Write a protein that binds this ligand. Structure first.
Ligand SMILES: O=C(CO)[C@H](O)[C@H](O)[C@H](O)CO
Ligand SMILES: O=C(CO)[C@H](O)[C@H](O)[C@H](O)CO
Ligand SMILES: O=C(CO)[C@H](O)[C@H](O)[C@H](O)CO
Ligand SMILES: O=C(CO)[C@H](O)[C@H](O)[C@H](O)CO
Lengths: 142, 172, 172, 142, 142, 172, 172, 142
């Protein structure tokens, strides 16, 4: 499975740890920010571009609060980014939403919890069906 | 101050609790979200709340769904809106103080009512404080999306999808 | 068919149950009654539902409050309306079949939800059966009140009372 | 205390029973339909007229289903009539609403229950206070 | 369809009216109290005996409050009697419960309403299935 | 005074409201009915409440289910019990005053909470008043059923049915 | 497996949701926590659940109150118990796998029901994985408090405090 | 105001950060683990001992998951330790419970959130009143 990752200065440290984790678990990782991005807008948009152009359908954005990377990337047409800070949304956003990416706030979520959130997100497939109407609506928006 | 609020059918009860609280606090509430718990679609209400805020009918907006992701994303995808998805007080305050977020999103099925109340209160009590740094971030965010006049102030924007739904196209 | 529904804060939960049922049944619903459980006033919603029916925006109306007396009385006091206060299936069917009542009132705090569902379904399923007898009764009923143009379709009709309320004129 | 009563052909029987009951319990009754009224519109309006034009604040209208007498009398500006079929509304409508009269349907409510309903209604006074705003609103309508 | 009916002095009048109604609608009626029973215990038990011995599965007991006929008849092993005063229980007790009989209180329920209750009860069949466990439990009791 | 209360899963919320009220009124409550809303069987709780009353662990009992018929009938089918099924205040008072009913049954899904409160209050406030007439009726009722020692104080009485249920014998 | 559950009056509704889920999952449930929403005291139910687990009447326990702190702390203060206060899936799994916690505490007013369900399921699904490392930690934990025979299996343990409460000693 | 702090090897890093934060904000801090404790049992018990044996009523325990320090310290008679991961409990546990200390898991909670949690906890006083009955009950337990 492919996973796109990116981060600004505040999320870089965790991004590096997660990258190691992903490689250890046989994931093909595409890091769009080998060096920390100027800010979360740059990193989140870099992740969005790489994702929407790649065949990957999973991505992780790292910054201080998560909120920013999601706020910025969701402005992109067709993109769906979920800020995740607990274990239920970790899988529900994948199951119900397009969850093309999740955003983790390094100042909000501890590492051990982030890994559980990440693994649940990666292990969950989109359910489609009735949920597609909402995704069609979102992709229609700017 | 005027607060617009919306929700999908999964969290109507949580929306009601927040509506009650806002009114007790002296706010004027414009309830847009769904009014009952009949299966519906979060983008509809996210868009309605977003436009109330963008058009100046409301000062701020609050949207909720099971996780908040769907409706807060729908709200964010509108001109003039900076929607922040916050299941905690810390990031909610950051959203208001640093990003001048004008729409707050919360997961009504993952956050308990007492904490939801705290998040809303903290968000509302917070004040945006401009700085050369966040002003620059905010400007970037406000210029990412390309405006679509066909979506702006068009309540029939999702009609095609609603018809396909009424015709069983989205069966499970 | 379109059903307009309204309620005060005491029975918002029962209103939600009925709204859900109506939609499952294929009816289009216009929810006017209050949306949360914050203290408000039944006449406001009774009047809104009444006008939807009278103006042709809705085919029939359903209104509820604790006992149903307040809001159903408010609905009755409008041009073109014949509101039937019915906490039972029998009188509700009579109301529709003989008096062609176009607004049904129910006490959401005195009737259990299963029975409320039965009353609503029976009322909707019933059909007005005109006879020279009931047509005379109905005509007499439609001519009791004297039309007041200041009330008809006037949203600010109760502003006077609402202001006094905000000023604490109606304290306990 | 005074009580105004009236009834059409369907509610006449119970009306006569209640009158005897009320008179036996020291109540001063004003019967506006010594002979059954043509219909519930005539009886309810007769009761309303006598009520609004008197110093009494309690009235009972009798007909077959209750709904009719309330539907008709509530069209009169200033009137407030409650159809009553159970014992909670019996007192609550007086406490909260102006409850100038209650309507009993003889085809719906049994006599023993009717007496309990009536007694509860007669024994309850209007609470005023916050409720007045709603009564002021109602009286403002046609 | 067969229907067993019975009543004491207080429920006799309505019993007679309902009997006429049932005959007019082609129901085969077995009246166990051509003359009013001494009390509701006698009438309710008379109805119970006739029912549990007949092939009929519908019965109506009449008394002043309904409560008594049900309280007494439910003491009989295998019997299930429902006091009914509204239109939802009228059918739900047949659908879910054994509802071998319903009890109507003439001092509680008006005639027009009683007829709607009766017709709904007569038109509803027991659903069986999951409900049978509760009926098996009840029939096991004294 | 001690009041035993029970219910099936359809009306647990109504039971909770009555429990709260009884305690506020100064009564000691013994809650036997089901505690959650997971599908279960009304006779189980009707029997438990009945025995609390018959064995003197409780002074009176109150049982509820959707219509009240099932659980009140279950309660009535026990030694020492006179269970009255009352969805109204009038017959409830009659039940206590004339039949000395010691178990009150109510339909939690057909009677609204405010009326349920009134029925319970009226029943409890009422006092049995012996007369040569009702003493005779009561004696008759107390001697109709034939005592079964196998049922009396046997909490495992329905085990056979519960096993058949766990084995899918009662499928729909 | 048998799960004992308890709660104070603030989260009775959330407890019901979990009880329902546990039963749907095939677990046998012993509900000890309060049954209605009348003001009561968390230590009572925390202790009851703790003893069910310690005495072997239940395999594991779950306790909840507004934040979960009160009742989980009460559960921890009993012989044979290791109570884990967890508002998240991650620490709950650690609690079971490393500390072999036998009682799970959750804040029913701060965690949303969907997340509570996830925490409970993850906690139950997890298995204790003994190592010389955690066995030493656990043994140290089991030997911190000094056993008090007057508390162990003593239902009247809090009578003293309850009496004072009835006497209005703890007024606000 | 005084604040007692302590941590094992996992929570040491954040503990050092918070100490600097607290000292910068005029707080008088008592660090009972200048060097990381052997484990969370040792650190939590050290904090508890210093607390119960001092005039301070606020304490913070740091470890990886929070649960351990609370599970251990709550075994001490009279101690009340709250694991805190969100901002509502942060203040409510102090208001309602004795909240003699809060436990923060560094693998669960990010630093920025930890500071908000800590500040809320430190700024909140015990309400007493009705809550005392529960605290009296807890202190009575082992
Ligand atoms: O959380 C949600 C969307 O993010 C919604 O509440 C759920 O998808 C729900 O099933 C309605 O679509
Ligand atoms: O039944 C009502 C009016 O008839 C209302 O529900 C109550 O008066 C309630 O207190 C609101 O005014
Ligand atoms: O009313 C009831 C029994 O008379 C019960 O609430 C319903 O049968 C319900 O479906 C449970 O069996
Ligand atoms: O969270 C709680 C105890 O930690 C309780 O829910 C509250 O204190 C509540 O007020 C009951 O005491």
């Amino acid at each position: 499975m492919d996973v796109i990752i990116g981060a600004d200065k505040d999320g870089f440290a965790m991004k590096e740890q997660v990258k190691k984790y992903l490689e250890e678990h046989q994931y093909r990782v595409a890091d769009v920010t080998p060096e920390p991005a100027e800010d979360f807008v740059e990193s989140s948009l870099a992740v969005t571009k790489k994702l929407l152009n790649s065949d990957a359908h999973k991505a992780i954005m790292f910054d201080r609060y998560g909120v920013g990377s999601a706020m910025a990337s969701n402005k992109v047409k067709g993109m769906v980014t979920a800020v995740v800070e607990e274990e239920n949304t970790a899988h529900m956003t994948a199951e119900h939403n397009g969850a093309k990416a999740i955003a983790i706030g390094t100042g909000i979520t501890g590492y051990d919890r982030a890994l559980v959130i990440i693994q649940r997100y990666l292990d969950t497939e989109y359910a489609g069906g009735r949920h597609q109407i909402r995704l069609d609506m979102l992709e229609k928006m700017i | 101050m005027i607060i617009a609020i919306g929700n999908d059918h999964i969290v109507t009860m949580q929306k009601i609790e927040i509506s009650n609280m806002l009114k007790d606090m002296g706010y004027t509430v414009i309830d847009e979200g769904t009014y009952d718990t009949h299966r519906t679609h979060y983008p509809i209400y996210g868009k309605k709340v977003a436009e109330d805020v963008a058009d100046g009918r409301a000062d701020l907006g609050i949207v909720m769904c099971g996780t908040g992701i769907g409706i807060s994303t729908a709200a964010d995808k509108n001109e003039g809106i900076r929607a922040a998805m916050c299941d905690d007080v810390t990031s909610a305050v950051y959203a208001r103080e640093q990003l001048n977020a004008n729409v707050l999103g919360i997961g009504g099925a993952v956050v308990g009512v007492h904490l939801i109340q705290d998040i809303v209160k903290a968000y509302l009590d917070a004040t945006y404080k401009e700085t050369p740094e966040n002003k620059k971030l905010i400007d970037k965010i406000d210029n990412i999306a390309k405006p679509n006049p066909d979506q702006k102030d068009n309540p029939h924007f999702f009609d095609a999808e609603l018809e396909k739904w009424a015709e069983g196209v989205y069966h499970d």
